């Protein structure tokens, strides 16, 4: 019973994610370092938790300062890098060289599994 | 690119999760005091959305950050904007329109002309 005028922006969530990706790439305002085959990746724990049940479990209730997470040897840079890029851009690209590793990393880090999707194109 | 997937919902889903964290006060890293009332957020999101906050966030220490907004900023005007930041929806009302318009200017590079919404007061 109060008059209201509401705006829903179709660009805002995309624009926030673009800004979070720029922070990640330029290593500013991030708060977690992920070690993958010993190589350093920077991210925001809030975004990793939103995007991966594996990371969420390693992030709940941790200390307030910089956090370090080491992923085990099952996770390669080849399979992980396309996925952190999907988390921050909404776009996932798989190459002939990395498709197997990425599929393995999706299953390892998330509740999803893309093997059966990729399998549908095996014959043509 | 043997396979390429583009998700039209992913950015919305990440923002939904950030909003849930904000409201439940988990995985946040900045407190904002507005008329003394406590709000929680992620400095990364505030810096992405507000030039005022960005200037008060970059280069600060890694631990918890605390920002006190001055008396110019009212809860009435600020709360609809933090809600827009975290949800992409801005609700203007008869009661809040002038204050929200003032806080937009105060906090960001944008402007909303209050004169264009005075019909909310009819």
A60-85 b/e (C-beta count within 10 Å ≥ 16 → b): eeeeeeebebebeeebbbbbbbbbbb
Residues 6+ apart with CB under 8 A from B100: B76, B77, B80, B81, B90, B92, B112
* Experimental technique used to determine this entry: X-ray
Considering only the beta carbons, identify the residue of A6, A59, A91 that sits closest to B90.
A6
Position B121 in a domain: no
Q: Distance between CA atoms of B26 and B19, rounded to whole angstroms? A: 10
Decide if B94 is inside a domain.
Answer: yes
Residue A34 phi/psi, 5-degree rounding, is -105, 130
Phi-psi region of B36 (alpha: psi -120 to 50; beta: other; left: phi over 0): left
Query: What is the number of structural domains in chain A?
Result: 1
Dihedral (C-alpha) A118, A121, B2, B7: value to the nearest 10 degrees?
Answer: -50
Interface A-B: count of C-beta contacts within 8 A: 134
Distance from CA of B106 to the nearest CA of A (A): 19
Three-state SS annotation for chain B? CCEEEECCCHHHHHHHHHHHHHHHCCCCCEEEEECCEEEEECHHHHHHHCHHHHHCCCCCCCCCEEEECCCCCCHHHHHHHHHHHHHCEEEEECCCHHHHHHHHHHHCCCCCCHHHHHHHHC
Which residue in chain B is spatially nearest to A58 when comparing CA positions? B27
Could you tell me if B109 and B49 are in contact, meaning their C-beta atoms sit under 8 angstroms apart?
Answer: no
Domain membership flag for residue A1? no
Q: What is the resolution of this structure in A?
A: 1.5
**Residues with Cβ < 8 Å from A68, sequence gap 6 or more?**
A32, A33, A35
- Three-state secondary structure readout of chain A: CCCEEEEECCCHHHHHHHHHHHHHHHCCCCCEEEEECCEEEEECHHHHHHHCHHHHHHHCCCCCCCEEEECCCCCCHHHHHHHHHHHHHCEEEECCCCHHHHHHHHHHHCCCCCHHHHHCCCCC
Give the strand pairing for A67-70 and A32-36: parallel
- Is there a domain that residue A47 lies in? yes
Q: Which of B49, B116, B58, B54 is nearest to B83 (CA)?
A: B49
Range of the domain at A98: 11-116
Are the C-beta atoms of residues B23 and B38 closer than 8 Å to each other?
A: no
The residue count for chain A:
124
CA distance linking residue A31 with residue B44, whole number of Å: 10
Interface of B with A in 11-50 (CB under 8 A): 11-15, 17-18, 21, 26-29, 42-45, 47-49
CATH number, domain containing residue A25? 3.30.710.10
């Amino acid at each position: 019973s109060m008059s209201v005028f509401a705006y829903e922006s179709s660009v805002h969530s995309t624009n926030v994610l673009l800004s979070l990706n720029d922070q990640r790439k330029k290593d500013v305002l991030c708060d977690v370092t992920i070690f993958v085959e010993g190589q350093r990746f920077r991210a925001h724990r809030s975004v990793l938790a939103a995007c991966s049940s594996y990371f969420h479990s390693r992030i709940v209730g941790q200390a307030d300062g910089e956090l370090n997470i080491t992923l085990p040897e099952e996770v390669t840079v080849k399979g992980f890098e396309p996925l952190i890029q999907f988390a921050y851009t909404a776009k996932l690209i798989l190459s002939k060289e990395n498709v197997d590793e990425v599929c393995k990393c999706v299953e390892f880090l998330s509740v999803h599994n893309i093997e059966e999707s990729c399998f549908q194109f095996l014959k043509f």
